[PDB]
Amino acid sequence: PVARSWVCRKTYVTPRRPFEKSRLDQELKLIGEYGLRNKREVWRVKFTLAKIRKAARELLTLDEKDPRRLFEGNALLRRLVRIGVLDEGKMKLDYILGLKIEDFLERRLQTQVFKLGLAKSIHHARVLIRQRHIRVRKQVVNIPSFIVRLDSQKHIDFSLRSPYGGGRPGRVKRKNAKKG
Amino acid sequence: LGTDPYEDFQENWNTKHSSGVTRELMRELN
Amino acid sequence: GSLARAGKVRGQTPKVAKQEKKKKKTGRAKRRMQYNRRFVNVKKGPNANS
Amino acid sequence: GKCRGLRTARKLRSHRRDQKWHDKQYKKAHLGTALKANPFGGASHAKGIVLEKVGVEAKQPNSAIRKCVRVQLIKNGKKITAFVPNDGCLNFIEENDEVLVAGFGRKGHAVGDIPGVRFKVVKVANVSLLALYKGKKERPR
């Protein structure tokens, strides 16, 4: 007997066919376009979308005025609107099945800091975030997979203690300044 | 001016290299 | 049979050393190279000879 | 045809019970004779002592000599033949050595040219054959 918790999950599922040529080209295109590290980072978002589509398909088989359909349908739709994947004027349970992986991949902090002009590429954004140069609402974040909530889009800035903001220069400029 | 997959397949469809000539001809076709 | 020819070709093969070469990228930069190689800048194969 | 009544559950269940025993996988798993005849006794690996070096001639159309070893199992005293996998890996084994032995890929069936051999060597004297073959470790002295 211990005061410990053993609850955990796996966040991805592997594909059934390991060497499907059409799927290998489709997934590398996403990796290259959004600057991902490995195929496991595509199967994670794809798993999350697969679980969202499965809840919607189960709610869509209930009565249109089923009390559980109107409670957990509104919650799912509101959750999808909040992060910016679904539109404000499309809060219908049939528009969830029209969602794509690219919608979910566009809300990553890595994509957003690049699309806001902080970084010169999608690979510069990765290192900028991992090197503690970016903050969201006074909090320093160094997780590139941080999903940006809609009313956080305006509060992504350079960190207050970084050479790219008002901070001191890094070790290299300091060392070369004393070189002469 | 390289090798011809059509001729390769037609001449080696029943030999040891049949599985490879089929693959090359399919690559040329699609 | 006679257990006297074990290791024959492995011991017969001449020994050739590996050429030293520039190290390979790893992680997010290795998979960027493949994307650039296959999609943005491009009936044969990656290892086609002649 | 088959009975389709509402009070047929006993008939259906008893018929399925009886007819499952004609499935050879089911019978092999659930009868118990194939567990007593298994030298490993249900284990994936086992340790044993080398008695002799043997050479098994391959089945036609192949013509070669697969290099195996006769091994006596420590836990029950049974005797098996184990194939030494790679090129020249028989030169690493000596008589009276203790070896780790595993199945050979087909759940008690022979594999390939090698007739009547169900096992393969993994380790000799607590050193894996892969490390010896690739020159990572040497036999203890």
Next chain:
RNA sequence: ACCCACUCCCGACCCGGGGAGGUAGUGACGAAAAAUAACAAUACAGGACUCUUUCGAGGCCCUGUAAUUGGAAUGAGUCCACUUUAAAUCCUUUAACGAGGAUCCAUUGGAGGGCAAGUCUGGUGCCAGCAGCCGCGGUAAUUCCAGCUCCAAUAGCGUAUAUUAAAGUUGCUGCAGUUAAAAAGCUCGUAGUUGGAUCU
């Protein structure tokens, strides 16, 4: 190995005790996050894209041998201190030192088909060996042993074994029985299974 500081229990008990329990050690059982580089200027194999019919101009946008240049950024480490804690360790926070290219160097399996990726070059010659299956090897081996190159996942990847799916190959949903495996030689007959209209 350390402690009753937490959760609780016991006693005459606000005070004592507790290998219950807590904390560290070992720990690739298993699960989560996530480094191993980024940018600019050059000159091309160059590429598209605009104009010149054409030579060409390209400062508009792109990829790479770049053993070409260049400073900018950072941990991983070493290590004051605080913080943590019963006392510590770790994480978090912070001074100082800490990155150019054989390095602060990614691995495990493969390249005939199933199944993504070389009838490249050298050696062997039904031998050695590969090979889950089909098969390869008898002097020009797409398959062995190696070099180079290539591709799959990646801080992970092979192997053995039990098991689930695949298996509509145990079939209630949902299989078959003329010739591929298979209807009892035939009829009676109890239990079991099933049982025609018909009532506001």
